[PDB]
Design a protein around this nucleic acid. Structure first.
Ligand SMILES: Nc1ccn([C@@H]2O[C@H](COP(=O)(O)OP(=O)(O)OP(=O)(O)O)C[C@H]2O)c(=O)n1
Ligand SMILES: [Mg+2]
Length: 977
DNA sequence: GAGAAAACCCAATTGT
RNA sequence: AAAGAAAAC
DNA sequence: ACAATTGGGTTTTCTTTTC
């Protein structure tokens, strides 16, 4: 639509609004006014922007000049121009607030003044000044009254927002003053946008060469800072000269931030450069995004929104604090709106060309400015002024990419200096205060930085557009769930941290997940050397990850921290700080604990031992009674694991989840030797997971009796387990073929297990191909070290066979629903429309596939993605219902996606809630509601007759439900266990 | 400054 | 951006 | 029809990309 430069100049004029100094923007408008082609292709919004800026300045003469230019060249005044005129009259006093001209002209012309006060976004001060200038003539006008906040009246979300009920809303263990000073610490952390963490690499006793390298590095850093300041001044002068030469420039974009801050940015980006450095484009995009992240925070400091946030947050913490009370207990967003909330007013992101040009300019500045003497080993008087970073191209790849390499001496200086400090950005670290409530798609999560509501790659905006144009009460439960997942307080387990750091700083233990040092790689000649370099690179790449996660664990060791949460486009909720969270590896889950603990109660130690047995991986198919018996039998190994983790018989290393098993052995040993095990405060999360969840949801949509009996929707004394049935069938087939001398069938004995066929049997209901199942079985066979690696490939072809022998008596109505969904998605995409639906909790979901280069939907991708995305949206709705009705009863609830975590005391309660919020979820006609929504959405147009008829008879051919009572899932024991 | 690891699949979509 | 690996559902 | 494309879905992270 709009041109690149036409979109670019609007960002320019908004940027001149952002940092004042506005006559350069006015001068550029005058230069465009000089030549009639130069003011051509200029949109009206840039005139509105500069008028509003002069209104903020209070200059009426320039306002009238821009008005005259608006009536020139055929442009028409709109509402923002009258808002700017009334704002100028608000700042001034002449004409006594347009007695004679402006409001009378507006009323005569026919534009509505209620739309002036309400529709278009203005800040509170500008709204007040325009309100005063309107009150100059006809003072009897009043603003339309603020309505009481709307409450969602959806049937699934009626109980959570009904006042007539008993609620037990939990409170943090932290007093209000401590919470307030932690808010201050997080604010100071976000203001200086990066955090320094001491590295958990082995500290070395310093030597003379270490001092010499560090002194040289400090002198070089000071010289680089001076050089970057000179380069930034020269760039700012030349770009200001370009603005005064009447062309586009990025000079206000450099004037967004202080020169100190930009030089500190460039130096800290240089510090975290790889040894074989990052490409030009990624580094440029990082520089621009980091510049925007600092600009938002700086704008909130200057604009005064930080003090408003401070006041509101100190009034807000009374709901969460232990020693404070609210007059009526409410949900966190309801209390956030009850205390009159400020406008968020976070800046919308710039157009992508401006961002790219800013990044390349900053990167080329860093390449050009910083330099070093050539030789450090020989200190001659004549040393060549050599660059620190080099631009090289890459020959191997198809499309050549620029790579910035460090100068090779700098690598040895960084190795010998051995700086003990890593640097993180503030958004990649857990928050030190409770996060802001999710009150809108725009507000929530971090304090000063904007966070998306839906995680999207490549800047797809149709998800956010669906979330904005929905009815506002539809997202409430979703928002509530996200806030509920943010308010959980976490802490780091100390003993596990000491053990992992002992293994990490010493010789690493790759069996237990701890990466080994850069040494201890293994060491026809070229083949061996290439293998050693490849394995050494893999070892180094793993140990860097471990260094970052363990450094954050060391930093957050004596702290209480929070993880704000987010969604993807389906409804599924992930935490925002990436390095150290509970959706991670075994070590990440072992390090983490609830900061608030609850007493165990009668069923705390019982569920704790059940959780431990589930962690060891042994006894999966047994009832819970035999899980308890197994826990009671192996108690000596539990106590020896807890007492001597590394100098004992080391039974916990044999567990399927070994570090989590060690943490639970520590918790159990603390519980059993206590004087009163029942009144013991436990901080360890206990897990409950559902068996074959996508199959559970297919069975609940179909009401299939055999399907519901298959995935534990019908109660039984023993668990039912689909994958160990399919494994038994394939083992029967294998023995039959291996009796006939089939070599691939012969070399598989003891190698067909649940884990081999698990993902394939899980995935046949999502339309897997035989090729995808082959890669699944291949990756599961490569992990078994005992199995012959020469015969993996043929084994894979023998195992896509005999597993796809599930043709009859396996998931009939499940594949009927799957077929109807796939045909529905195929025929929706055949007309050219992406598949949209609404979650039963009200969340709109759209599929961002559109593989065109993005103009036309990719039919294959849409039909393959619709069954998993629909079932995943349903399980997210299940999770959010369970979370909300657990909040109403006082439960600390976090979710790892079919896996629900709580204290050991509340597990039964959560189970009850879980089953109820399944039953209420699928009692709704989800198939019928989806069918009529898709008929309304895609089959309501008169232009296409036959296509809409075929899609309508496809959509109205919904599969009929079977005969299964959903209430009986409330009686099920192994539904979630 | 300058060439035997080996990838092996095999049927539904899509630009042409 | 492409490749070598790793983790979670 | 012909040859190229593709392979059930989602989320996160690391050091290297000519030897
Ligand atoms: N590669 C994939 C694709 C989808 N899911 C989705 O997560 C759901 C449950 O996650 P799992 O950990 O695999 O648990 P189950 O399928 O229920 O198997 P189990 O009985 O052992 O818990 C199933 C499926 O809808 C998954 O875990 N892994
Ligand atoms: Mg599960």
């Amino acid at each position: 639509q709009l041109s690149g430069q036409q979109q670019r100049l609007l960002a320019f004029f908004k940027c001149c609004l952002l940092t004042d100094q506005l006559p350069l923007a006015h001068h550029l408008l005058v230069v465009h006014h000089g030549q009639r082609q130069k003011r051509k292709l200029l949109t009206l919004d840039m005139y509105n922007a500069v008028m509003l800026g002069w209104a903020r300045q209070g200059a009426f003469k320039e306002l009238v000049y821009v008005l005259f230019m608006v009536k020139d060249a055929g442009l028409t005044p709109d509402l923002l121009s009258y808002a700017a005129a009334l704002q100028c009259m608000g700042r001034q006093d002449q004409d006594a607030g347009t007695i004679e001209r402006c409001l009378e002209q507006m009323s005569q012309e026919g534009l509505k003044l209620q739309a002036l006060f309400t529709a278009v976004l203005l800040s509170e001060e500008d709204r007040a000044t325009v309100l005063k200038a309107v009150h100059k003539v006809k003072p009897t006008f009043s603003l339309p009254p603020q309505l009481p906040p709307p409450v969602n009246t959806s049937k699934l979300l009626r109980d959570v927002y009904a006042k007539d009920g008993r609620v037990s809303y939990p409170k943090l263990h932290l007093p209000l003053k401590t919470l307030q000073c932690l808010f201050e610490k997080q604010l100071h952390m976000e203001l200086a946008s990066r955090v320094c963490v001491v590295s958990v690499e082995k500290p070395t006793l310093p030597s003379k060469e270490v001092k010499h390298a560090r002194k040289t590095l400090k002198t070089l850093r000071d010289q680089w800072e001076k050089a970057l300041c000179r380069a930034l001044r020269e760039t700012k002068n030349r770009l200001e000269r370009e603005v005064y030469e009447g062309r586009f420039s990025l000079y206000p974009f450099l004037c967004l931030l202080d020169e100190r801050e930009v030089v500190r940015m460039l130096l800290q980006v240089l510090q975290a450069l790889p040894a074989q450095g990052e490409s030009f484009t990624t580094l440029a995009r990082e520089l621009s995004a980091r510049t925007f992240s600092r600009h938002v925070v700086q704008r909130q400091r200057v604009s005064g929104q930080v003090q408003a946030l401070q006041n509101h947050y100190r009034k807000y913490l009374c709901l969460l604090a232990s020693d404070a009370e609210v007059p009526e207990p409410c949900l966190p967003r309801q209390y956030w709106e009850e205390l009159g909330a400020p406008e968020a007013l976070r800046e919308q992101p710039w157009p992508l060309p401006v961002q790219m040009e800013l990044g390349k300019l900053l990167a080329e500045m860093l390449v050009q400015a910083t330099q070093m003497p050539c030789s450090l080993d020989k200190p001659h008087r004549s040393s060549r002024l050599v660059p620190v970073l080099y631009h090289v191209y890459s020959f191997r790849n198809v499309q050549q990419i620029g790579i910035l390499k460090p100068h090779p001496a700098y690598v040895q200086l960084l190795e010998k200096a051995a700086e003990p400090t890593l640097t993180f950005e503030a958004v990649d670290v857990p928050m030190l205060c409770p996060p802001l409530p999710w009150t809108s798609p725009h507000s929530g999560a971090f304090l000063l930085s904007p966070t998306k509501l839906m995680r999207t790659v490549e800047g797809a905006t149709q998800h956010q557009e669906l979330l904005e144009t929905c009815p506002p009460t539809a997202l409430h439960g979703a928002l509530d769930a996200l806030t509920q997942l943010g308010n959980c307080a976490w802490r780091v387990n100390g003993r596990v941290l000491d053990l992992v750091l002992q293994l990490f700083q010493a010789k690493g233990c790759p069996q237990l997940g701890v990466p080994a040092p850069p040494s201890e790689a293994p060491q026809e000649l070229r083949r061996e050397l290439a293998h050693c370099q490849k394995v050494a690179r893999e070892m180094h790449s793993l140990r860097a990850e471990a260094l970052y996660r363990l450094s954050l664990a060391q930093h957050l060791r004596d702290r209480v921290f929070w993880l704000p949460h987010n969604m993807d486009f389906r409804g599924r909720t992930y935490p925002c700080p990436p390095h150290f969270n509970h959706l991670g590896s075994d070590v990440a889950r072992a390090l983490l604990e609830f900061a608030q603990g609850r007493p165990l109660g009668p069923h705390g130690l019982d569920w704790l031992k059940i959780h431990l047995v589930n962690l060891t991986g042994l006894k999966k198919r047994e009832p819970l009674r035999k899980r308890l018996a197994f826990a009671e039998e192996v108690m000596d190994d539990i106590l020896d694991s807890a007492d001597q983790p590394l100098t004992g018989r080391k039974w916990w290393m044999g567990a399927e989840e070994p570090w989590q098993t060690l943490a639970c052995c520590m918790e159990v040993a603390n519980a059993v030797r206590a004087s009163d095990p029942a009144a013991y405060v436990s901080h360890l999360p206990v897990h409950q997971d559902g068996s074959c969840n996508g199959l559970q949801h297919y069975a609940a949509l179909g009401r299939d009796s055999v399907g519901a009996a298959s995935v534990n929707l019908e109660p039984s004394d023993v668990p039912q387990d689909v994958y160990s049935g399919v494994a038994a069938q394939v083992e029967v087939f294998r023995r039959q073929d291996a009796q006939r001398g089939m070599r691939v069938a012969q070399v598989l004995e003891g190698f067909i297990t649940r884990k081999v066929v698990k993902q394939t049997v899980m995935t046949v209901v999502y339309g897997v191909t035989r090729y995808g199942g082959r890669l699944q079985i291949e990756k599961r066979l490569r992990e078994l070290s005992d199995f012959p690696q020469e015969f993996v490939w043929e084994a894979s072809h023998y195992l896509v066979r005999q597993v796809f022998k599930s043709l009859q008596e396996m998931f009939s109505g499940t594949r009927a629903i799957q077929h109807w969904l796939t045909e529905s998605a195929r025929l929706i995409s055949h007309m050219g429309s992406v598949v949209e639906w609404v979650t039963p909790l009200g969340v709109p979901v759209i599929q961002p596939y559109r593989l065109d280069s993005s103009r036309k939907p990719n039919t294959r991708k849409q039909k393959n993605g619709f069954p998993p995305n629909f079932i995943h949206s349903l399980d997210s709705s299940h999770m959010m219902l369970t979370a909300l009705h657990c909040y109403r009863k006082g439960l600390t609830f976090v979710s790892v996606h079919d896996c629900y975590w709580t204290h050991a005391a509340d597990v039964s309660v959560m189970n009850q809630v879980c089953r109820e919020q399944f039953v209420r979820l699928h009692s709704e006609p989800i198939l019928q509601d989806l069918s009529r929504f898709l008929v309304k959405r895609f089959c309501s147009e008169p232009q296409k007759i036959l296509e809409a008829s075929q899609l309508k008879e496809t959509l109205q051919a919904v599969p009929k439900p079977g005969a299964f009572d959903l209430e009986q899932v409330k009686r099920s024991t192994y539904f979630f266990s």
